[PDB]
Ligand binder design. Structure first.
Ligand SMILES: Nc1ccn([C@@H]2O[C@H](COP(=O)(O)CP(=O)(O)OP(=O)(O)O)[C@@H](O)[C@H]2O)c(=O)n1
Lengths: 124, 48, 49, 195
RNA sequence: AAGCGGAGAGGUA
DNA sequence: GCGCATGCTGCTCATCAAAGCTGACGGCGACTGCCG
DNA sequence: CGGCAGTCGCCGTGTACCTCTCCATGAGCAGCATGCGC
């Protein structure tokens, strides 16, 4: 059984849709924590469910010494699973450090499950 | 200004080579174009 | 109330005549949309801003 | 990736809009990734196959309307069942009148959804019929539908490379001759624009 | 055999 | 007396930041919605 | 369609000389140095 297929099925069963939000470099984890705290404070867990920042262990070469250092696969971008509602939309937009909903044209757009699978399976 | 241009170009090239979703690469391209515009004539469009 | 208090000038009459707003929440929403560009004009936000 | 020189797009007049005959707002939206642009279109294939396309769209419309009719008949049978269930008796007839009107409104919403789907299909078809180069499509759903169903016989893009392709397909001589002809006979503002 | 750019303030004819 | 752990401290690196700001004015042209 | 009037943006605004002060941060990531326990 292909583990990618298992992850794909698990995502298919999961509720909500995935959206990408632009952030600042070196603030991915901090913005993630801010999102968690703000959502919990306002009790909007019915909309915002999960937050993840993909990472990959790349062999950084310190003068020829290879160390598996965590590098962000997509610098400056965060992934959030939720349902796009006005309350949740405003809450996410107004989180300190969040630049905005990345999307084609002007309206935010939702990634396909294939892309999310490609960027979540363990590879580092 | 040259430093920003080259940094943005390298980031966009790395993102393209990795096969990221087209929307992210479009965002990177928009930022790269704005960077070059700022290099050639700063203040013409937007915030200097 | 505007006529009850501002009832001594004709320019006020002219301004009232071409108003077509006659509404508190309608005016709040209009101001919220005019001031803040690009956001859902919720009544709570309009009446708080 | 290609980029555009700032001098020839944001100057006054816009030297890049005077060449392609495009308003500066359209260039601003296209270049900075806010709208799609149809770079070229083929009319031979479209005009040699329009009959099949119209037939396919009519078939889809007929299928949608038949399904809506089936749903409406099911709703009518449910309403008749409710009428014969407890609405015949007077005591509960007033109470079941609310359910009868609820069924009628369910039928009305079924018709509304069928109408909305037919309207979407007809808008897609009409937009396909009138496709011309250098046309701006803002909403992404319409463009994605067009590229998916009728991706052949038409090509669009977004960004500065779209502008590059437009300039590639530009023919100087024809438009120069057209401008000179308009200069010869004609008066008003169009003369100023042509000059 | 070795360096010399920007910002602000106050003056003279 | 030696090993382990915890807190000042030197070194190092990033550009997408926005809340602050508010006392110039004439000439000339594109242009853009807006009325008719 | 046809005008149309306002509105917004960009351009320009004298010459030569003298003296003084100041010029990015914050937070992270090792690198020890000292105290405590066996
Ligand atoms: N901002 C400035 C101030 C002064 N100047 C120059 O300094 C002189 C001032 O003369 P002045 O007024 O001090 C006496 P003067 O002109 O000789 O008239 P009088 O003998 O009847 O008293 C002028 O000739 C100017 O060329 C300038 O170029 N720019």
């Amino acid at each position: 059984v292909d583990p990618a297929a298992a992850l794909k099925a698990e995502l298919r069963s999961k509720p909500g849709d995935w959206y990408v939000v632009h952030s600042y470099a070196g603030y991915e984890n901090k913005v993630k924590a801010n999102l968690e705290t703000r959502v919990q404070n306002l009790d909007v867990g019915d909309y915002i469910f999960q937050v993840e920042v993909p990472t990959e262990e790349v062999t950084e070469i310190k003068n020829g010494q290879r160390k598996q250092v965590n590098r962000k696969v997509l610098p400056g971008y965060i992934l959030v699973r939720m349902d796009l509602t006005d309350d949740s939309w405003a809450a996410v937009r107004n989180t300190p450090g969040v630049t905005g909903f990345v999307g084609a044209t002007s309206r935010p757009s939702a990634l396909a499950l294939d892309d999310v699978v490609k960027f979540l399976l363990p590879r580092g | 200004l040259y430093r920003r241009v080259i940094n943005r170009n390298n980031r966009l090239k790395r993102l393209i080579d990795l096969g990221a979703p087209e929307i992210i690469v479009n965002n990177e391209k928009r930022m790269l174009q704005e960077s070059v515009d700022a290099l050639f004539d700063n203040g013409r469009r937007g915030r200097p | 109330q505007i006529v009850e208090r501002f009832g001594f000038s004709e320019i006020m009459r002219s301004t009232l005549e071409k108003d077509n707003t006659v509404g508190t929440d309608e005016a709040l929403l209009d101001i919220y949309r005019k001031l803040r560009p690009g956001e859902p004009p919720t009544k709570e936000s309009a009446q708080t801003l | 990736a290609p980029v555009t020189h700032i001098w020839y797009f944001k100057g006054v007049p816009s030297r890049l809009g005077y060449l392609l005959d495009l308003a500066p707002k359209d260039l601003e939206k296209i270049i900075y990734f806010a709208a799609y642009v149809i770079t070229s279109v083929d009319e031979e294939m479209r005009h040699n196959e329009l009959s099949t396309l119209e037939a396919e769209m009519a078939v889809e419309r007929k299928a949608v309307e038949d399904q809506r009719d089936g749903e409406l008949e099911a709703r009518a049978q449910k309403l008749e069942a409710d009428l014969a269930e407890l609405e015949a008796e007077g005591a509960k007839a007033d109470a079941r009148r609310k359910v009868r009107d609820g069924g009628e409104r369910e039928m009305r919403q079924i018709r509304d959804r069928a109408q909305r789907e037919l309207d979407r299909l007809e808008d897609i078809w009409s937009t396909f019929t009138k496709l011309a180069p250098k046309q701006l499509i803002v909403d992404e759903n319409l463009y994605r539908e067009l590229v998916d169903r009728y991706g052949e016989y038409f090509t669009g893009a977004m960004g500065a490379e779209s502008i590059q392709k437009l300039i590639e397909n530009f023919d100087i001589d024809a438009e120069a001759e057209s401008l000179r002809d308009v200069i010869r006979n004609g008066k008003g503002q169009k003369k100023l624009r042509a000059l």
